[PDB]
Amino acid sequence: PICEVSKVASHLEVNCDKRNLTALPPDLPKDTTILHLSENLLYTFSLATLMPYTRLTQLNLDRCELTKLQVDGTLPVLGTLDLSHNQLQSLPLLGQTLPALTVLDVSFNRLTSLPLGALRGLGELQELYLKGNELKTLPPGLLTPTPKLEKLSLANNNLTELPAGLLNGLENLDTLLLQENSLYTIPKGFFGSHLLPFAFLHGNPWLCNCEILYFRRWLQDNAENVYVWKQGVDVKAMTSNVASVQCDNSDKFPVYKYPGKGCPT
Ligand SMILES: *[C@@H]1O[C@H](CO)[C@@H](O)[C@H](O)[C@H]1NC(C)=O
Ligand SMILES: *[C@H]1O[C@H](CO)[C@@H](O)[C@H](O)[C@H]1NC(C)=O
Ligand SMILES: [Pt+2]
Ligand SMILES: [Pt+2]
């Protein structure tokens, strides 16, 4: 039986996880809508070899020792692609071969930075996950190509500072995770004017000092919008905690409680 198939109305799912595969299995019912290839041996894979599956809509290359993934044309309806927990050291330019991609997950890899026109081409993206990588900086105009982005997570990286215009235009942005990095401040106007339902900013050496001021006021207007990331706790039991954003300024003093020792308005 090699993999295993099922049928949920349209769908014709193919599950081939934990199977020491090394390469894509032969049979694969050409008409597969959702293929699961999680936790297998691959090291290398080419979206090209999937070209035969016109209806493939979800691909999970989740945990497959991947170190390289080359992109090539076909795969016009692929909506979600998970490259979770792997080894790629460079973000693959998927924009020219995954036009329908709406959720990309390459979190927990060896990414140290993103190419220039990285997310170019995939202007249908709604969820981007890059948690667990490195990255100290982000290419300018990173999200310009993805105007309808809703969830964005750069949690647990090494971001020192981030563009003052990163979130410009994202009018559907409802979730932003920036926790566990090493950001020291927030550019004036960063959060712009869109209401952010869920923000995670704890675990940063926030250098509160007059520049943090803009961030302070923001933290005050959105105190019930900033939470803390806990293991497997569900938002059903999550509670706000604006005081989780504190200055690493040898204190554990909540920025947002920071008066701003007489500083220029
Ligand atoms: C990111 O933080 C880690 C923490 O252990 C550190 O080892 C690493 O050098 C930092 N960024 C890089 C990879 O330069
Ligand atoms: C794949 O190979 C590994 C290593 O020998 C083995 O433990 C595993 O059982 C094989 N796949 C399965 C789960 O049948
Ligand atoms: Pt083709
Ligand atoms: Pt939560």
Report on this model:
- This protein has an eleven-stranded mixed β-sheet, with no helix packed on it. Strands 4-6 form a two-stranded parallel ribbon.
- The chain has a single domain (1-265), classed as Ribonuclease Inhibitor (Leucine-rich repeat, LRR (right-handed beta-alpha superhelix), Alpha-Beta Horseshoe), CATH 3.80.10.
- It has one helix at 212-221, and strands spanning 5-6, 13-15, 34-36, 44-46, 58-60, 68-70, 80-82, 103-105, 127-129, 151-153, 175-177, 198-200, 226-227, 246-247, 253-254.
- The chain contains one helix and 15 strands.
- Helix 1 links the parallel strand 12 (198-200) and strand 13.
- The protein is 4% helix and 15% strand.
- It has 265 residues and is mostly beta strands.
- The site of one platinum (II) ion has 3 residues, from loops.
What ligand species are in this complex? 2-acetamido-2-deoxy-beta-D-glucopyranose, platinum (II) ion
What is the H level of CATH, i.e. the homologous superfamily?
Ribonuclease Inhibitor
Strand content: 15-25%
Estimated structural class: mainly beta
CATH class: Alpha Beta
Number of H- or I-type helical stretches: 1
Domain count: the total is 1
Fold topology:
Blueprint: E1 5-6, E2 13-15, E3 34-36, E4 44-46, E5 58-60, E6 68-70, E7 80-82, E8 103-105, E9 127-129, E10 151-153, E11 175-177, E12 198-200, H1 212-221, E13 226-227, E14 246-247, E15 253-254
This protein binds 2-acetamido-2-deoxy-beta-D-glucopyranose (2 copies) and platinum (II) ion (PT) (2 copies).
One platinum (II) ion is lined by residues 233, 235, 238.
